[PDB]
Write a protein that binds this ligand. Sequence first.
Ligand SMILES: Nc1ncnc2c1ncn2[C@@H]1O[C@H](COP(=O)(O)OP(=O)(O)OP(=O)(O)O)[C@H]2OC3(O[C@H]21)C([N+](=O)[O-])=CC(=[N+]([O-])O)C=C3[N+](=O)[O-]
Ligand SMILES: C=C[C@@]1(C)CC(=O)[C@]2(O)[C@@]3(C)[C@@H](O)CCC(C)(C)[C@@H]3[C@H](O)[C@H](OC(=O)CCCCN3CCN(C)CC3)[C@@]2(C)O1
Ligand SMILES: Nc1nc2c(ncn2[C@@H]2O[C@H](COP(=O)(O)OP(=O)(O)OP(O)(O)=S)[C@@H](O)[C@H]2O)c(=O)[nH]1
Ligand SMILES: [Cl-]
Ligand SMILES: [Mn+2]
Ligand SMILES: [Mn+2]
Ligand SMILES: [Mn+2]
Lengths: 189, 190, 322
Amino acid sequence: HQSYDCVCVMFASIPDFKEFYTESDVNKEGLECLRLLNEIIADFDDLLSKPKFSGVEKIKTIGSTYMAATGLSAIRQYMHIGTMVEFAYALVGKLDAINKHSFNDFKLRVGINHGPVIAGVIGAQKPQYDIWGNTVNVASRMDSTGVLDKIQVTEETSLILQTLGYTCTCRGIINVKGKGDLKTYFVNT
Amino acid sequence: DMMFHKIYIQKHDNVSILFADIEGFTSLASQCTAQELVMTLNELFARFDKLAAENHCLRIKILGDCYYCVSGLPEARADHAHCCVEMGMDMIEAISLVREMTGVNVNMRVGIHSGRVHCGVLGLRKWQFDVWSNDVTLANHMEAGGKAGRIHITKATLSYLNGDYEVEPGCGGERNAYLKEHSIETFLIL
Amino acid sequence: ATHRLLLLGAGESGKSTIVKQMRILHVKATKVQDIKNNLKEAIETIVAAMSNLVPPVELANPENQFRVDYILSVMNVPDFDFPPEFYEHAKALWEDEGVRACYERSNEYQLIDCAQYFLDKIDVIKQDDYVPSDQDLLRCRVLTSGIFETKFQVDKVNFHMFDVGGQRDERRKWIQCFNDVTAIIFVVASSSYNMVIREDNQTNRLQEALNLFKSIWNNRWLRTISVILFLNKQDLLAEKVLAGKSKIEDYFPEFARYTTPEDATPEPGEDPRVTRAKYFIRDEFLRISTASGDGRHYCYPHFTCAVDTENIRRVFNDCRDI
Ligand SMILES: Nc1ncnc2c1ncn2[C@@H]1O[C@H](COP(=O)(O)OP(=O)(O)OP(=O)(O)O)[C@H]2OC3(O[C@H]21)C([N+](=O)[O-])=CC(=[N+]([O-])O)C=C3[N+](=O)[O-]
Ligand SMILES: C=C[C@@]1(C)CC(=O)[C@]2(O)[C@@]3(C)[C@@H](O)CCC(C)(C)[C@@H]3[C@H](O)[C@H](OC(=O)CCCCN3CCN(C)CC3)[C@@]2(C)O1
Ligand SMILES: Nc1nc2c(ncn2[C@@H]2O[C@H](COP(=O)(O)OP(=O)(O)OP(O)(O)=S)[C@@H](O)[C@H]2O)c(=O)[nH]1
Ligand SMILES: [Cl-]
Ligand SMILES: [Mn+2]
Ligand SMILES: [Mn+2]
Ligand SMILES: [Mn+2]
C-alpha cells in the first residue's frame, strides 16, 4: 500500500434513516427497510458509471453512509476536488428522486475534505481496500457535525473550492479530537 | 428481477455480535507516524482475522480502529455466545503487545450481544458483507459503553452462555445513553 | 394461492371501512368508547365553527347559548365520563336550526363524516345498555397510524388485506408493502370534492387524491402492479349533486365541458345529473392511468360505498375476477 499526497475524501450519510428503520412484523422484521436502503445505495452507485464521475472511487458504505475518495487516480491539479463536490450534489439529486416515489423527505449530509492519505488493503482473511490518514478523519468529522443538505469543508478546502468557482460561508468552529478546534465552511448552492 | 434490485440479504437468529474498538487511538496516533499506525493497525487485525477462524467467529468489517465479527455464521452454531466471548478473551492480549513496542493505554472495548440479524450486501458496487439489525446496533452501543480490557455482554448473551462464565454488573446505563434509554441490563466477564 | 392487497388513498378516503367489510363478510365495550368520542368530537366541531365562519352563523334559540358554552368548556377533558347532561345538551344543540345551518357548511372546516349518523341518534348511544350495530362500527372513525395486516379467506383462497395511514405523514410507511404486492386498492372520497385536505386546510381533498394516485400509478416500484380504483362515497356525492348549492364546476372548471359517457351504465332510477358527475370524477383518474403504464398494469374503476356492506359485497366479487 502506497501513500498519496492529495486525495479528496467525502462522506454522505442519512441521519434520517436510523429512525426510518424498524423491525416490525409487517416489514419482514426490518428486511423491507433495508430494501429501500438498497435502492438508495444502488442509485448512488449508478453515478460511478457516469463519464464526469469516472474519477470517483467508492471506498465503502458505513451503515447508511456513503464514502468515496476522488484523487486516487485508480482503484488544475486540484480539480478532482470540485468534481467530488459535483458527486455530492449528484447524490442529493438522486436521494430526492427516491423520496419522490418513497414519500419520505430524506436529506443528505455531506462532509468533504482533501489531503494526504494511505491507500491500501487490510485484513488477512478477506483482503479489503481502504484508505487511512488524518485526512479521512477530518472529512468524517465534518459529516457527523454537518447540516442537512449542506457540504462542510475546511479552510484549505473552502479556499480551493472558491478558486474553482464555489462560494463558502463560515459555519463556525468545530472540535476534532486530537486536532482541537477547526474552522469549517458550507459550500453555498 | 424487475421492479426492485435483488437484495442479497438473508435473515438469521441465535447469533452473537462482538464489537471492539481501540481505546484512545489518537493517543498514539499523535505519536506514531501516519504509516507506522497503518502497520500496527494491519498488524493487529491480522492476528484478529486468524484468532477469529480459531474461535469460529466470522469477520464482518474493519472500520478504522473498530473491528467486529459475528458468531453463528454462516453455518449455525449453538456455541455462538462462547465464540465471541472467547474472541474478546484472546483479542485483548493481541492489543497489549501494542504497549510493548508502541503507544500505551491501548486496550480493546469488547461489546457482545445476541439476537437475530440480517447479513448480506447492499448497493451494487464494491460489495461489503455487513450486518443490519437493532440487535447489531445494540452490540455497537454495548462496545461504546464498555470498559477497557473487559468484555461487555448484555442479558441475552448471558443466557446463551449457559452461565459458564463468571460475570458482574455492567452499569451500561450510566455509560451509554442508549443502554439507558432502552433499559438494558449489562454485565462484564470476570 | 395467497394474494397481498394493499389499500391506498388519501386520509379519510374510506380504507379502514373496507377492511371492516372484509371482516364482516368473510370473517363492544372497547369500541363503544370511541363511538361516543366520535359523537363528542363531532358536536363540539360544529358549534365552534359558527363564530369562525364568514359570515358567522347565529343560533336560532339564544337559550342554547348556554349549552354552547358547556360544550366549549369540556372540549378538552382527558377522560370525559360522558354524563347524562352532555347528551341532553348535545341533542338540544343538534336540534337548534342554527347549529344545522352551520352543518350544511361542514365543508368549510374539518369535520368527520359520521357526524350526521351519530348525532341523529343521541338517544340510542346515551343508553347504558348501548350495543353498537354493524353499521355503527362501520360509521365509526378512528385515525389509522401505521400498517395493519388483515388475514381472511374467500372460497378456500387466502388473502392479505393491508391498511396503512392515508395521511401525508404516514405515507412514508407505504414503501414497506410495495414489493411483492399482488394488487393495489386505491380508495377515494368522491364526495370530498368541495372540501380541503386536513394537513394544511388549503389543498383540495379530491386534487390531493388525484396527485396521490398519479404518484402511485407512476411509481418506479409499481410498474407492473395493477391498481383497482374505488370511487368511494357515491352516496354523499349524489347527495351534494342533488343539493344544487355546491356546484362542482366551481371547484373543477373542466366539468363545464364534460359530458356523460355513452358507454355509461347509470343505476336504476339514477338521476342523470348524478351520472354525469359520478363518471366525471372517474375519468379524472383514468386520464392519469391512460397517460402511461401500458400493458404492464391497468386500472379498474368501481363506484363504491364503504359503509354499504351490500355494495362492497358486490364490487368486491369483481376484484376477485381480476
Ligand atoms: N467516521 C469515520 N469514518 C472513517 N474513519 C474514522 C471515522 N471516525 C474516525 N475514524 C478513524 O478512526 C480512529 C478513531 O478515532 P476516535 O473514534 O476519535 O478515537 P479512539 O480511538 O481513540 O477511541 P475513543 O473515542 O476514545 O473511545 C482515527 O484514527 C485515524 O482515523 C480516525 C487517524 N486520524 O484521525 O488522524 C490517523 C491514522 N493514521 O494511520 O495516520 C489512522 C486512523 N485509524 O486507523 O483509524
Ligand atoms: C440500517 C439501519 C440501522 C438503524 C441498523 C444497523 O444495524 C446499522 O447499520 C449498524 C449498527 C450495523 O450495520 C453495524 C455497523 C454500524 C457502523 C455500527 C451500523 C451504523 O451504526 C448504522 O447507522 C448509522 O449509520 C449511524 C451511526 C454511525 C456511527 N458509527 C458507530 C460505531 N463506530 C464504530 C463507527 C461509526 C445502523 C445503526 O443503521
Ligand atoms: N357517508 C359515508 N361515509 C363513509 C363512506 N366510506 C367511509 N365512510 C366514513 O368515513 C370516515 C373515514 O373512513 P376511514 O375508513 O376511517 O378512512 P381511512 O382512509 O381509513 O383514513 P385514515 O384512517 O388513513 S386517515 C369513517 O367515519 C367512515 O364510517 C361512504 O361511502 N359514505
Ligand atoms: Cl380522498
Ligand atoms: Mn477507538
Ligand atoms: Mn472508532
Ligand atoms: Mn384508516
